[PDB]
Write a protein that binds this ligand. Structure first.
Ligand SMILES: CC(C)[C@@H](NC(=O)[C@H](CS)NC(=O)CCC[C@H](N)C(=O)O)C(=O)O
Ligand SMILES: [Fe+2]
Length: 328
């Protein structure tokens, strides 16, 4: 099994005002997006040491009582309004992974999309502050930190495609973004439950099957345990781990609006019996955001693809992924 070419790109010029340096970053984003579809963002300015430590303290401290109280509707029939946000329980002996998902901290009972009961908008649920001091403060702060990095990355993607730098970022707003953070724990278990291991067609043991992401882009921090593979025409290739950088890839909304010029790479998660963390940020736009598709391959950029509202795209995509790859 070969290793994927995943370049490390210094994204720090995207926070600055040297326009030529920004173009040089854009070229590297373009090149990576047209090859395997993955790159590492380095020199990003986020304290990922604190991110991993605070996430670890939470996963290891939370009790079954608290998990039921935070559980999404798939695990707790009483929580009909928690489809996305909350705790995704493991099932001892059956399901190893567990995770906590939260949404835009600005979605409050007072927020107009919450008042209108608009699908995919939810109010976050949090553990008790006395049992997990500082956890909510940390997590909300982290959302805005990775929002900022993601904004900058979106300027690079715009420039790479020949657009003005706010082409995507103008739709990525703190008041209405549907972006989510998921804090995923993959545990060490001995014996490891066989029901939690999937066998791929090629024989590889997996934790999560092939998929394209439901996102515009995905901005991922993982601890230093190799697990991801990306599909190429010549088969799956291993993505090397790097626990100082963020792993970036496009989701299927980018593939839609570029007429597949930037594909959403198909990837899967190998089974590895090791304690590790996977902390994705899914860059989603607003419910009513619409970007007119274009084809960068054509001089006039003409595309026949229908514009797709981000809210409709997200509603269909999240359900489809659950149906295909299982309730996480
Ligand atoms: C990366 C991680 N996989 C994942 O995060 C998988 C595939 S990208 N993602 C999902 O299940 C979609 C989560 C959507 C989230 N609940 C929301 O409402 O916005 C892993 O390591 O399994
Ligand atoms: Fe993914």
């Amino acid at each position: 099994v070969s290793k994927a070419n995943v370049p490390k790109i210094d994204v720090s010029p995207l926070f600055g005002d040297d326009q030529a340096a920004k173009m040089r970053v854009a070229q590297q984003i373009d090149a990576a997006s047209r090859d395997t579809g993955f790159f590492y963002a380095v020199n990003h300015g986020i304290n990922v040491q604190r991110l991993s430590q605070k996430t670890k303290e939470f996963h290891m401290s939370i009790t079954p009582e608290e998990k039921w109280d935070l559980a999404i509707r798939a695990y707790n029939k009483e929580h009909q309004d928690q489809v996305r946000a909350g705790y995704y329980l493991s099932i001892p002996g059956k399901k190893a992974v567990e995770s906590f998902c939260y949404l835009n901290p600005n979605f409050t009972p007072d927020h107009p999309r919450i008042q209108a009961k608009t699908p995919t908008h939810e109010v976050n649920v949090w553990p008790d502050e006395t049992k997990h001091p500082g956890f909510q403060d940390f997590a909300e702060q982290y959302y805005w930190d990775v929002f900022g990095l993601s904004s900058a990355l979106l300027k690079g993607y715009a420039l790479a495609l020949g657009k003005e730098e706010n082409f995507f970022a103008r739709h990525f707003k703190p008041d209405d973004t549907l972006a989510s953070v998921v804090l995923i724990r993959y545990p060490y278990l001995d014996p490891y439950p066989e029901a939690a291991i999937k066998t791929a067609a090629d024989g590889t043991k997996l934790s999560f099957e092939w998929h394209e992401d439901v996102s515009l882009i995905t901005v991922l921090y993982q601890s230093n345990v190799q697990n991801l593979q990306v599909e190429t025409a010549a088969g799956y290739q291993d993505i090397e781990a790097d626990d100082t950088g963020y792993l970036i890839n496009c989701g299927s909304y980018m593939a839609h609006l570029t007429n597949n010029y930037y594909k959403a790479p198909i990837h899967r998660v190998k089974w590895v019996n090791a304690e590790r963390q996977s902390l994705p940020f899914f860059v989603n736009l607003g419910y009513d955001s619409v970007i007119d598709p274009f084809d960068p391959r054509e001089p006039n950029g003409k595309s026949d693809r229908e514009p797709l509202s981000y809210g409709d795209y997200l509603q269909n995509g999240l359900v489809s992924l659950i149906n295909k790859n299982g309730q996480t």
